[PDB]
RNA sequence: ACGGAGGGGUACCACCAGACGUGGAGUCUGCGGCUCAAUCUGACCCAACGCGCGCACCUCACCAGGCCCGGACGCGCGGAG
C-alpha cells in the first residue's frame, strides 16, 4: 500500500508460490476464488504452515507490479519470499 | 587551339658517342580469353597489367547447405488461473 513498492523493486502464481510456501522459505500468505481445489490446497498446506487471507483478489494485482500505467490483472498469491 | 609556316631557346622520360638491356628458352606474378556451381571485383597509350601492402578457415563480396533476432521507442489488444 505504501512501502510494498520498495519490496517489488515476493512472487505471484501457483507454480512459484508452492515452490516457496514449502521448504519454509515463505513469509506471509494471502488467499483469494474460482475452484476449491485451488482454495483448499494451499489452505491445507497452510494448515501445516503466516496463513492469512486478504480481503480482495484484485489489489494483489494492484499492489504487485502486474500493471504498466491502467490494466490491473487479478492474481492470487501467498509467498513473500524476499521480504527484504 | 592547330599548322608537312618562319625565328629564338631547351631536355639521356630527346639525339650525337658509347654502355647495359628486353622481345628467343624454363619459371614467379598480373592482365584477356575457355571452363565450372562459383572460378568475386576496380583500372586498359603516355596517364590499366608484383597495382588496389603475403588469399588452406576469417580476410570475402562469390557457390552448396544450415543457426539467431541481436524488431529500439510510442499507440491499440492479451497476458502470472
Rg (C-alpha) for chain A, rounded Å, is 12
d(C-alpha A84, C-alpha A70), whole Å: 27
Residue length, chain A? 84
Residues by CB within 7 Å of nucleic chain B, which ones? A 12-14, 16, 33-34, 64-68, 71, 73-77
Closest Cα to residue A74, out of A25, A47, A38, A21?
Answer: A38
Give the C-alpha separation, A70 to A80, whole Å: 24
Residue A12 in grid coordinates: 505471484
**Contact present, A3 and A66 (Cβ < 8 Å):** no
Resolution (A): 3.2
Q: For A3-42, b where at least 16 C-beta lie within 10 A, e where not — what string?
A: eeeeeeebbbeeeebbebbeeeebeebbbbeeeeeeeeeb
Amino acid at each position: 500500500k505504501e512501502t510494498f513498492k520498495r519490496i517489488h523493486n515476493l512472487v505471484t502464481g501457483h507454480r512459484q508460490v508452492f515452490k516457496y510456501l514449502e521448504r519454509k522459505r515463505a513469509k506471509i500468505c494471502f488467499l483469494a476464488c474460482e475452484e476449491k481445489q485451488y482454495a483448499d490446497i494451499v489452505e491445507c498446506l497452510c494448515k501445516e504452515y503466516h496463513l492469512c487471507k486478504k480481503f480482495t483478489r484484485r489489489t494483489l494485482g494492484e499492489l504487485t507490479g502486474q500493471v504498466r500505467c491502467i490494466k490491473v490483472v487479478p492474481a492470487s498469491a501467498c509467498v513473500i519470499h524476499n521480504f527484504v
